[PDB]
Design an enzyme around this catalytic site. Structure first.
Site, short mmCIF file in Angstrom:
data_model
loop_
_atom_site.label_atom_id
_atom_site.label_comp_id
_atom_site.label_asym_id
_atom_site.label_seq_id
_atom_site.Cartn_x
_atom_site.Cartn_y
_atom_site.Cartn_z
N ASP A 1 0.82 -1.20 0.00
CA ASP A 1 0.00 0.00 0.00
C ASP A 1 0.86 1.25 0.00
OD1 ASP A 1 -2.63 1.14 0.01
OD2 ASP A 1 -2.56 1.41 2.19
N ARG B 1 0.37 9.28 -0.08
CA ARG B 1 -0.58 9.56 0.99
C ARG B 1 -0.21 8.78 2.25
NH1 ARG B 1 -3.34 5.85 -2.01
NH2 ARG B 1 -3.98 3.95 -0.91
N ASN B 2 0.36 7.60 2.07
CA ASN B 2 0.74 6.77 3.19
C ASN B 2 2.15 7.02 3.71
OD1 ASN B 2 -1.81 5.43 3.09
ND2 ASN B 2 -1.04 4.21 1.37
N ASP C 1 1.14 3.43 7.82
CA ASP C 1 -0.01 2.62 7.46
C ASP C 1 0.37 1.20 7.07
OD1 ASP C 1 -2.39 1.53 6.36
OD2 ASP C 1 -3.09 3.58 5.88
#
Lengths: 257, 258
Positions: free
Chosen positions: A127, A131-132, A145
């Site tokens: 992932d 954004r993470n 995350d």
């Protein structure tokens, strides 16, 4: 790793996401990040994320501070606070007129080292995206995350490698693909992947060899790293160590300035 | 003077567009053909050096979406000649006969253009200081070019402490998004200025206008962040609005109004 709820004061909600929520908090006097996981009836998503986090220790991975389990059912993961928010926002806010080439490459190396560490400990992030990735008060980018983090085996289509969306197994090579996408995000200053294409064309276009264009003002060498991450034949993709070496080769000859 | 300088017989002041305190503005002709807007100074309001600041700048600044200075006449009476924009302000256009026919694809596109211009403004380290629909001009093919006391469109930090920055310009952009999305309406409807200052200070923010997809409002709230270093750049704004219907709302169906 157990923390006490009485010493945690939930100040405000930093973000309400689709798979969990994050809140700024105060634990024993220090600002802290508190996360709760949605749609987790048996709490196994919670357990899985907390567990793996107790096993990660790298300076470029958001650090676990502890776990909070209220018998009533409130399950929280306490994490170090990252004052500058997600890398996506940091890029969008400050933008081109503030962030020099060194800053951008420095962020890439930060993430790359985190990833080399994960690969070295047999973990797949699944992932990885701007954004993470969060930024600390003194500009250190760290991957965060770890919900989907598991040893060599839903995934965000625009960031996931073709074989990954199709095959039931994920591998570091798909992570490398995501790294490629992330770099594009970095040198695009937060812009969203595959700008002028419908979300229903991505995979088929991509598999038909499509590849995003080098961002505006992107160093050719940086773009070649991206491209190298986007080979359709996963095995041909670079190792994270090979990615670090090449980003270092770029920095060493200032091919990014 | 410059060879921006023209003979004041080449100009041909034809139809009066409007007026105001700082001289008037006309449609017309320069040299033989060429449509032109012709701005003038009233000898009475401000000095020669005053109303020849917006030529100090309007010379240096060339961009597709800033209205282009063509040529001046410096020794009063003054005449700034620029490119003609033939549907008037954004407000009139939107707020007038055509206004009612515009839907979201069209307004979003206009907004992407404004931001393309405010991103060129951005790149040059300039600052607009009064960005709102009334100061955008419209032309053939729904084209929109930037150029030329509004507390309701102005960022808190500017409204109170006088810190105008390109990020304080972004704030107005977001207010300007309410203008496009309700087709002409004053922001903060049925509020006087003291409430707008009062309430934005306590954290209030214009809701989501009628039928306005919620991905639009988010980006208005991104423009209205208290802390100005966080509001997104015109370069982010621009791209978001360019890709709106593929990346953000690719399953948008036209409604009653938007």
């Amino acid at each position: 790793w157990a923390l006490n709820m009485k010493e945690l004061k939930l100040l405000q909600t930093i973000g309400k996401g689709e798979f969990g929520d994050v809140m700024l908090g105060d634990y024993r006097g220090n600002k802290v990040a508190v996360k709760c996981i949605k749609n987790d009836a048996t709490a196994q998503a919670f357990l899985a994320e907390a567990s793996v986090m107790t096993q990660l220790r790298h300076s470029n991975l958001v650090q676990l501070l502890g776990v909070i389990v209220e018998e009533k059912g409130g399950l929280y993961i306490v994490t170090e606070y990252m004052a500058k928010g997600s890398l996506v926002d940091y890029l969008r806010s400050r933008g081109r007129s503030v962030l020099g080439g060194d800053c951008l490459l420095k962020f890439s190396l930060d993430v790359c080292e985190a990833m080399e560490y994960l690969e070295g400990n047999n973990f797949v992030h699944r992932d990885l995206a701007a954004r993470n990735v969060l930024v600390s008060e003194d500009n250190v980018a760290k991957v965060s995350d770890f919900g989907l983090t598991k040893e060599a085996s839903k995934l965000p289509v625009k960031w996931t490698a073709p074989e990954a969306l199709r095959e039931k197994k994920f591998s570091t090579k798909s992570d490398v693909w995501s790294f490629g996408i992330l770099l594009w995000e970095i040198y695009s200053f937060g812009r969203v992947p595959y700008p002028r294409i419908p979300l229903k064309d991505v995979v088929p276009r991509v598999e038909k060899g499509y590849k995003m264009d080098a961002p505006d003002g992107c160093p050719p060498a940086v773009y070649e790293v991206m491209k190298n991450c986007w080979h359709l034949d996963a095995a041909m993709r670079p190792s994270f160590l090979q990615l670090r070496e090449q980003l270092e080769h770029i920095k060493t000859h200032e091919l990014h300035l | 003077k410059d060879a921006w300088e023209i003979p004041r017989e080449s100009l041909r002041l034809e139809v009066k567009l409007g007026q105001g305190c700082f001289g008037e503005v006309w449609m017309g002709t320069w040299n033989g053909t060429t449509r032109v807007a012709i701005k003038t100074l009233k000898p009475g309001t401000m000095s020669p050096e005053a109303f020849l600041q917006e030529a100090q700048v309007m010379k240096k600044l060339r961009h597709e979406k800033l209205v282009q200075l063509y040529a001046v006449v410096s020794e009063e009476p003054i005449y700034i000649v620029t490119e003609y924009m033939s549907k008037g302000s954004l407000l009139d256009f939107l707020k007038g006969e055509m206004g009612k026919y515009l839907r979201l694809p069209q307004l979003v596109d206009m907004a992407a253009q404004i931001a393309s211009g405010m991103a060129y403004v951005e790149r040059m380290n300039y600052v607009h200081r009064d960005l709102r629909a009334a100061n955008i001009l419209v032309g053939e093919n729904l084209v929109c070019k930037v150029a030329d006391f509004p507390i309701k469109w102005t960022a808190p930090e500017a409204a109170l402490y006088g810190r105008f920055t390109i990020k304080s310009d972004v704030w107005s952009f977001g207010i300007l998004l309410t203008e496009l999305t309700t087709k002409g309406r004053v922001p903060y409807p049925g509020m006087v200025n003291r409430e707008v200052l009062d309430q934005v200070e306590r954290g209030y923010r214009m809701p989501c206008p009628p039928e306005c997809p919620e991905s639009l409002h988010d980006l208005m709230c991104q423009c209205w962040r208290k802390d100005p270093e966080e509001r997104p750049t015109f370069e982010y704004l621009q791209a978001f609005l360019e890709d709106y219907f593929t990346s953000t709302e690719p399953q948008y169906q036209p409604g009653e109004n938007l």
